[PDB]
Amino acid sequence: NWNQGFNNYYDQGYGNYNSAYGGDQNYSGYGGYDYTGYNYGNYGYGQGYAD
Amino acid sequence: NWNQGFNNYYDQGYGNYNSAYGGDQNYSGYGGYDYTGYNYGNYGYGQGYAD
Amino acid sequence: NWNQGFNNYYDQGYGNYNSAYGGDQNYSGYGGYDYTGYNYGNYGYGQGYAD
Amino acid sequence: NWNQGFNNYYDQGYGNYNSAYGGDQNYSGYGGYDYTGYNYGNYGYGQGYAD
Amino acid sequence: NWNQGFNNYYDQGYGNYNSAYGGDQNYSGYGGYDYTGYNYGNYGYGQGYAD
Q1: What are phi and psi of D26, to 5 degrees?
Q2: Residues of C in contact with D7 (CB under 8 A)
């Protein structure tokens, strides 16, 4: 028995679920508040940043 | 038994589900509030940023 | 019995769940507040930063 | 019996759960506040930083 | 009986849970505040820093 629900959210509270059943879950994004992010990663074929 | 529901949302509360059954789930986006994001990643064939 | 729910969120409180059932969960992103992040990692085939 | 919930969050308090059932959980990201991070790691095939 | 919850967070207090059920949990990231981090580690196949 694995439980992650039965949560109550008020005002501006939120909650996100990133799940992978029978696999591997990879997280590489951004979260939080009052931040600046720059994405240059390579996820397909080639290069992300060319200098 | 895996549970992630039975949640109550009030006012401006929200919740997102990113799931992958029989596979791998990859997260590379942005979340939160009061942030600035720039996306330059390469996801297909070629390059994301050309300098 | 594994429990992670039954949480109450008020005002601007939030909570995220990154889970992987029958697999490995990899975290490489950013979190917190008042930060600046630069992503140059290589996740596919090739190189992330080309100098 | 393993418990990690029944938490109360007020104002801007938050809490994240990175879990891996039947697997290994790897953490290599950033957390906290008032920090600057640079990601150059190699997670796929090739090299992260090319000098 | 293993307990890690029943915590109260006020203002900007937070708490993160990195767990691995039936496996090994590896931590190699950054935490705290007022710090600068550089990631060059190799996590896949190849090399992290090429000089």
Answers
A1: -115, 125
A2: 7-8
